């Protein structure tokens, strides 16, 4: 039952990821002063301008231009030869700030907006994530690590990766194609770039046993990649949602994460759905689990909760849905309380995926033991 | 094996769908003149402005502001009481 | 009856003169095609963006971004070390 599956990822220098980081950098700055703020930030990045817009309900004061320039400068855009300069780019702000207001049960607050959220978890990997997306993130993350520490000074922030895994009866048996498009300077020649990228990025990351002679490598297939970043293509917040969550391995509700405060179910419930999906798999209840949570605006309780185990469940499916409702409080404020999301920790989550990194509140498997005992699996 | 499944949709007046229609209205106008054109249009819609941007490789001439205002007017935003007016909104072009 | 009188002038690289040249570069491009056109162009120049706006009553087609970048490039702003780059600056059109 061999079949090829492909997943891709982009580096922090990609225009669609610059907007995500800028939006979350604004969110983290606000959460430091007013944790209970309401933030919905949208960022548009063009060849020489950054447009930061959205509606904010807070009492905090932030300098949008300073935050934006620092975020871009940290990425590594410092002069116009790269195609974008942090110190000489227009930073327009369209942010509409309001004033917070001032006795019922806090956990009974209705959802601020409707939407669909999907959570996924599989025992395929150690971090309970799909394998193809994890290694796609490793390549671009390795590219930024190598570029910044000075191993390859001629690299530039923009980079994209794409790995095609060859499954066989549900198990990975090799890698069929690796694509690594990276932005460089005009100093380096094309032939030497491919040798360096292959030896210094692809080799240290991917396991050597998967890379056989049949594996095809496409390192800058077109040619030179000197001018990139915002000049090469426009960037908008939430255009890279699939590469953030799971790649193509799991369904997605369609709600962007970056630039949204935890009070919006479009972000917190997706984290919560991943939280309950990871715990179910970590508890041994199922090899793969997919959770769908749906909210109606102005209504506290979710309109629907769906658990799907793809016929890999150790307990009857209707029993799992009872366990999810019993243990996890899925009301919009209950998600914040059970995950402690009111902290400025969202700058780091907008770079190489919101899932799979264990230092996040929603990546903790603490209720796994409780679920296993409740299901009576000993 | 009962299980609830939910799907949602938004009308053409939704802000995220106004941008989609404006972007494709620009695309259709270009394809009428130069079918082999290369269009990558991104639209940002705010409270009182519409920002149309992207990179176009064509020999066609189009009036972005006229296309954008006609698209919004056909949706049904005609005065500020609705929260958005097609005849009195800023249409910036970064194409 | 001695008295001191002072007058001043600015170079073509001054920000207030870049806007004037950009506005008239647009005007000259339109007048080449439609001499009887009606042009009222206002240009706003910031740290990294150029905003070209105004109302035009003509039958001519002009590329505002190409005209603006060529005008700034001829002045001599070619890289960001000078504080402004013609090849990597935002050119928004509100015409």
UniProtKB/Swiss-Prot annotation, chain A:
Required cofactor(s): Mg(2+); Mn(2+); Co(2+); K(+)
N6-acetyllysine found at: 2
InterPro entries: ADOMET_SYNTHASE_CS (IPR022631), S-AdoMet_synt_C (IPR022630), S-AdoMet_synt_central (IPR022629), S-AdoMet_synt_N (IPR022628), S-AdoMet_synthetase (IPR002133), S-AdoMet_synthetase_sfam (IPR022636)
Keyword set, alphabetical order: Acetylation, ATP-binding, Cobalt, Cytoplasm, Host-virus interaction, Magnesium, Manganese, Metal-binding, Nucleotide-binding, One-carbon metabolism, Potassium, Transferase
Annotated residues for binding of ATP: 14, 158-160, 224-225, 233, 239-240, 256, 260
Sequence positions that bind L-methionine: 55, 98, 233, 264
Annotated residues for binding of K(+): 42
Gene3D superfamilies: 3.30.300.10
Consequence when changing residue 240 to M: Loss of activity. Modification in protein conformation
Reactions performed catalytically: L-methionine + ATP + H2O = S-adenosyl-L-methionine + phosphate + diphosphate
Outcome after substituting residue 14 to N: Loss of activity
Gene Ontology molecular function: ATP binding; identical protein binding; magnesium ion binding; methionine adenosyltransferase activity; potassium ion binding
Residues the entry annotates as binding Mg(2+): 16
Subcellular location: Cytoplasm
Any one GO biological process: S-adenosylmethionine cycle
Transmembrane feature ranges: none
Gene Ontology CC annotations of this record: cytosol
Effect recorded for residue 16 to N/A: Loss of activity
Induction: AdoMet activates the tripolyphosphatase reaction.
Co-factor remark: Binds 2 divalent ions per subunit. The ions interact primarily with the substrate. Binds 1 potassium ion per subunit. The potassium ion interacts primarily with the substrate.
Main location as per UniProt: cytoplasm
Quaternary assembly: Homotetramer; dimer of dimers. The active sites are at the interface between subunits; each dimer has two active sites.
Full protein name: S-adenosylmethionine synthase
Native species: Escherichia coli (strain K12)
From Swiss-Prot, chains B, C:
Induction text: AdoMet activates the tripolyphosphatase reaction.
Source species of the chain: Escherichia coli (strain K12)
Entry protein name: S-adenosylmethionine synthase
UniProt KW keywords: Acetylation, ATP-binding, Cobalt, Cytoplasm, Host-virus interaction, Magnesium, Manganese, Metal-binding, Nucleotide-binding, One-carbon metabolism, Potassium, Transferase
Cell compartment(s), UniProt: Cytoplasm
Biological process per Gene Ontology, one example term: S-adenosylmethionine biosynthetic process
Annotated GO MF terms: ATP binding; identical protein binding; magnesium ion binding; methionine adenosyltransferase activity; potassium ion binding
Family, as annotated: Belongs to the AdoMet synthase family.
UniProt lineage: Bacteria, Pseudomonadati, Pseudomonadota, Gammaproteobacteria, Enterobacterales
């Amino acid at each position: 039952a061999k079949h090829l599956f492909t997943s891709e990822s982009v580096s922090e220098g990609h225009p669609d990821k610059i907007a995500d980081q800028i939006s979350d950098a604004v969110l983290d700055a606000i959460l430091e002063q007013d944790p209970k703020a309401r933030v919905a930030c949208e960022t548009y990045v063009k060849t020489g301008m950054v447009l930061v817009g959205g509606e904010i309900t807070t009492s905090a004061w932030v300098d949008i231009e300073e935050i934006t320039r620092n975020t871009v400068r940290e990425i590594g855009y410092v002069h116009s030869d790269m195609g974008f300069d942090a110190n000489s780019c227009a930073v327009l702000s369209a942010i509409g700030k309001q004033s917070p207001d001032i006795r019922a049960d806090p956990l009974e607050q209705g959802a601020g907006d409707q939407g669909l959220m999907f959570g996924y978890a599989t025992n395929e990997t150690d971090v309970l994530m799909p394998a193809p997306i994890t290694y796609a993130h490793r390549l671009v993350q390795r590219q930024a690590e190598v570029r910044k520490n000075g191993t390859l000074p001629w690299l530039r922030p923009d980079a994209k990766s794409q790995v095609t895994f060859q499954y066989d009866d549900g198990k990975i048996v090799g890698i069929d194609a690796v694509v690594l498009s990276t932005q460089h300077s005009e100093e380096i020649d094309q032939k030497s770039l491919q040798e360096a990228v292959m030896e210094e990025i692809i080799k240290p990351i991917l396991p050597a046993e998967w890379l056989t002679s049949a594996t095809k490598f496409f390192i800058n297939p077109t040619g030179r990649f000197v001018i990139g970043g915002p000049m090469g293509d426009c960037g908008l917040t939430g255009r890279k949602i699939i590469v953030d969550t799971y790649g193509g391995m799991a369904r997605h509700g369609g709600g962007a994460f970056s630039g949204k405060d935890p009070s919006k179910v479009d972000r917190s419930a997706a984290y919560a759905a991943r939280y309950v999906a990871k715990n179910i798999v970590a508890a041994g209840l199922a090899d793969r689990c997919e959770i769908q949570v749906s909210y109606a605006i102005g209504v506290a309780e979710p309109t629907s909760i769906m658990v799907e185990t793809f016929g890999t469940e150790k307990v009857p499916s209707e029993q799992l849905t009872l366990l999810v409702r019993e243990f996890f409080d899925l009301r919009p404020y209950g998600l914040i309380q059970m995950l402690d999301l009111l902290h400025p920790i969202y700058k780091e989550t907008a770079a190489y995926g919101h899932f799979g990194r264990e230092h996040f509140p929603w990546e903790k498997t603490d209720k796994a033991q409780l679920l296993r005992d409740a299901a009576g699996l000993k």
